[PDB]
Symmetry: D2
Subunit: 237 residues, 4 copies
């Protein structure tokens, strides 16, 4: 199936499957059962920022999530992406809701990837920045319920006409061009992703969360991955 | 058919269709018959650099082609791209040979596009830089005889095993992701493209040329566009 | 004395000295009497954006000023900066008030300059971006009444504790490092500057304006340059 | 005195003071006796590249030094720069020779710094790239024997008219503008430095080395810091 490396911003604790008993951010390597998690003081209705970084020298995937004037949550995990992902991948954002729901609104998203060749010592680079999403954003592959243009935002999961989030929704947005994430002959390689989001929920328990992911080029939403599986995994193994 | 805006580095003068009687660089707007040209002292076997710029404030497309320690050739043309191209396009490089030939080798290629919206005054941007091309360059759509990986270069037209260029060849390389080149609510929109090339020819008259182009997203090589047509136009009109 | 090239956002019409009879943007080359102006529909109390561009190929200094969802004002003037400015300069923002006043608040400021060698075809570049100004911004040279840190903004002219603008004020802010704006052996040189401002006035006629400027490295506020002189010129000649 | 954090490319082993018995790269925190070192297969007369990265999330300073088609040497050290350096600093390059010598030629140098505020979540950034050094490089503070312009290169240490390196030389080059390396209210802060060098020596043992360093703004070369002190420290403690 698909190979997924993801940083999840999990708003709903699903303890039956390994989740700690509070909202949290985690690093998922081919499984929804986070290799490492951190407590996340999610604020309903506020705009927050997630920053994801990695480099081939340190081989550490790190993420910082925060809201203005509040403490940030950080999670890091040592992982050599060379052994996990194919050299060419697609990057994207995914979100879901189940019995409980929330808006999974993306207000901005940027990504920078750099590869320095050992033979050449010159760099190949890719950078994209979205601060506005149009109703016909052709450089984005929208999967599931994901839509763009509403107020210039990216809505990963279904929201009704009047602005209310729907349950049992799943959606993803992948950047159109494949990304060369690693290469055997590379001296240094690194990527950095940033996105601002707005998670808002009418009910007591918001669910299920947002995730920045890296996958094989032809990745598709596994059937039935609504809710706990965050639109990324086919099962809870 | 296709909508094409291109900057050509024409090495072969086809006077029957409007070419000046010497190698030159030109700005082509929907026709191979350049709106503006400038004399170009092409140097057989030397590595050159081409720099193309445009901004929606001035509405002027400019290109500078030069070799290290030599005079540069410059050509500019006032054109409002909103009236010629669709708002979403693909960018690429094209080349061809005919009775006469030449290698149409690309050693590097970079492009940067920016769009500042009117509703938000926030910018969307795209940037890619290739200084090395691998044998499996998944973020390039290769058309015709174009290939990559040979010495880390991009060969737009057919070259034999021993390095000799072939005639009646046409090839193009387009960046995988569509580019939002303009929008009605844009305060400013600009792009910049740079590429280094190596044109080498065994015969007295090198042909036919290399071109940086912008087209509709689904653009493909028009049949019989070898030689003078540079793999861009269906006829000489 | 000083050599000044500037783009003014002139809010007060001083018809005695050439100003047209309405708010306007203009290009000033060594004199407060602009070489070219354009009507500017200034909006009291709204945040606007100014974008200034120039390149050595077209040798045209262009500027666009606009407010979200409003028409933009544009002004362009052909000028070869090599003949006017020394090769090493400082870039900054200046503002003033006189009998009438306004806040001359700068919310963000970025600048990018690139010089490309003819010998090498390689680039030297400088880029800075301020989206926040701290109380002790060591990379900015503040002159006159300019201060930083208040709400993380840069106040070019005097503003009272309660937020009310004072008359007869003048202040500037220059980036600390000299900038290599042009070079004889350069193939292509270009610069781009962007700043967001907030001009708010309690009285009927706001005055006097804000200006982006380029000057010799050791430039200082000319004595008596409040009001119509915008902290840039010693007289109205 | 001064506060120095440096990455040294030490070519001469001074075993009395801690150096391992071979050329190496190391991370120095307020002392010439490196906290961590790694064997470095220095190649006399070849052009190499040094890449230094740091981010405040991982709080790890890493450096990779290599030559095209050769293995790289890597060294990392966990250090929270907030506890050692002031929030504003100057960045530079230093080099020295003693009884033995070498050319300490810098061919290129780039640096990028970014600081994201907690209060706002907006980034302040600084970027400079030098691929050519001119005879009057006004944005560099040259100290000691350092000079620029020769072939467009930066010579940190004294080289005679005929290209031969001198002994007992020391020199540094610092970027003119102070750099905001950290802040209490920062969500993320990171920097990346890259430079290409050419170490060539006529004698059997090249000495003494090159260092990328970060210091207090008003740092100057300590007197007598030739040889093993690399133009950075007053003594060997
Ligand atoms: C009723 O208890 C069980 O089911 C609960 C509901 O589970 C759905 O909703 C979740 C939150 O949106 C989602 O994560 C899950 O996949 C289901 O779609 C659940 O809260 C309990 O933990 C339990 O499994
Ligand atoms: C026989 O003369 C005519 O054809 C000549 C050859 O034309 C081919 O080769 C050209 C150069 O490679 C190319 O531009 C053209 O499209 C054909 O592929 C031509 O050189 C003469 O000018 C004339 O048209
Ligand atoms: C008395 O009329 C003359 O002076 C008036 C006041 O001029 C001051 O205020 C102006 C607006 O702040 C400023 O531009 C000028 O330099 C003086 O500080 C002026 O309004 C009239 O136009 C006239 O010059
Ligand atoms: C007498 O042997 C000792 O000193 C030698 C000379 O030391 C000078 O030169 C060194 C190499 O350039 C330099 O590192 C040092 O600071 C002095 O300037 C040295 O070569 C021997 O290894 C030994 O320490
Ligand atoms: Ca969960
Ligand atoms: Ca032709
Ligand atoms: Ca005026
Ligand atoms: Ca040593
Ligand atoms: Cl000593
Ligand atoms: Mn989880
Ligand atoms: Mn032509
Ligand atoms: Mn005026
Ligand atoms: Mn050492």
């Amino acid at each position: 199936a698909d190979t997924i490396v993801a940083v999840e911003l999990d708003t709903y604790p699903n303890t039956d499957i390994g989740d700690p008993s509070y909202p949290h951010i985690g690093i998922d390597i081919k499984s929804v059962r986070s290799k490492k998690t951190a407590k996340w003081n999610m604020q309903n209705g506020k705009v927050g920022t997630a920053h994801i970084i990695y480099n081939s020298v340190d081989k550490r995937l790190s993420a910082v999530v925060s809201y203005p004037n509040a403490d940030s949550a950080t999670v890091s995990y040592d992982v050599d992406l060379d052994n996990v992902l194919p050299e060419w991948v697609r990057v994207g954002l995914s979100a879901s809701t189940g019995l409980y729901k929330e808006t999974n609104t993306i207000l901005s998203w940027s990504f920078t990837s750099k590869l320095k060749s050992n033979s050449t010592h010159e760099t190949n680079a890719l950078h994209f920045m979205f601060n506005q999403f149009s109703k016909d954003q052709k450089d984005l592959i929208l999967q599931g319920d994901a839509t763009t243009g509403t107020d210039g935002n990216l809505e990963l999961t279904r929201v009704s006409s009047n602005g209310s989030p729907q349950g049992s929704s799943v959606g993803r947005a992948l950047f159109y061009a494949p990304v060369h994430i690693w290469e055997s002959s590379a001296v240094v390689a690194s990527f950095e992703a940033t996105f601002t989001f707005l998670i808002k929920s009418p009910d007591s328990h918001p669910a299920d969360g947002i995730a920045f992911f890296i996958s094989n080029i032809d990745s598709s939403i596994p059937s039935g991955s609504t809710g706990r599986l965050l639109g990324l995994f086919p099962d809870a193994n």
